[PDB]
Curated annotation (Swiss-Prot), chain A:
Record-annotated Glutaredoxin domain positions: 1-95
Further remarks about this protein from its record: Present with 704 molecules/cell in log phase SD medium.
Cystines in this chain: none
Section covered of the full-length record: 1134 to 1233 of 1233
Protein name: Uncharacterized protein YFR016C
Organism: Saccharomyces cerevisiae (strain ATCC 204508 / S288c) (Baker's yeast)
Length: 95, 98
């Protein structure tokens, strides 16, 4: 039931090294997995910066955050989850 | 009144009703609400009877997607929300109305 509740939350690609190419791969991966998303640009989105600064524990951008601050992973973690065929689960079945 | 209405509205859940340009327009609404710091969740009228009924009853012909406050307070469809946001009055539309 975690799933239904999470599926109602917006998923964000946090963006702002290799920033654009990695952001493009996140866009392609989430699209291929039928995961809807929008961008938040930490260049101009102060709430986004706070969330990332508070939870990233050092992770480089870009990344994926569910809802207000359920940080899911940075680009490398998202790519690994996708390679494990478990991306929808990592995003919609967690916490 | 007014400040009272605001406080009561701050207790209400805000929803984006979604299911043409459905995906691109819904994306915009999400970005707009997010940029206005308005917390929200999605409702898919495809599988959500209440939301589907609410839209049918109150839209008066407006195309989806849209924004709904509480159970039945239709704030606007995507175009109205985009106009309100352009006018810098989206937050007033949502929190200062009965």
């Amino acid at each position: 039931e975690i799933r239904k509740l999470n599926e109602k939350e917006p998923v964000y690609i946090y963006t702002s090294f290799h920033m654009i190419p990695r952001t493009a791969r996140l866009c392609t991966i989430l699209t291929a997995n039928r995961i809807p998303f929008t961008y938040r640009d930490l260049g101009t989105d102060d709430e986004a910066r706070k969330v990332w600064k508070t939870f990233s524990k050092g992770r480089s951008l870009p990344g994926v955050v569910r809802g207000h601050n359920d940080l899911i992973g940075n680009w490398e973690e998202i790519e690994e989850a996708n390679e494990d065929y478990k991306l929808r689960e990592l995003i919609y079945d967690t916490i």
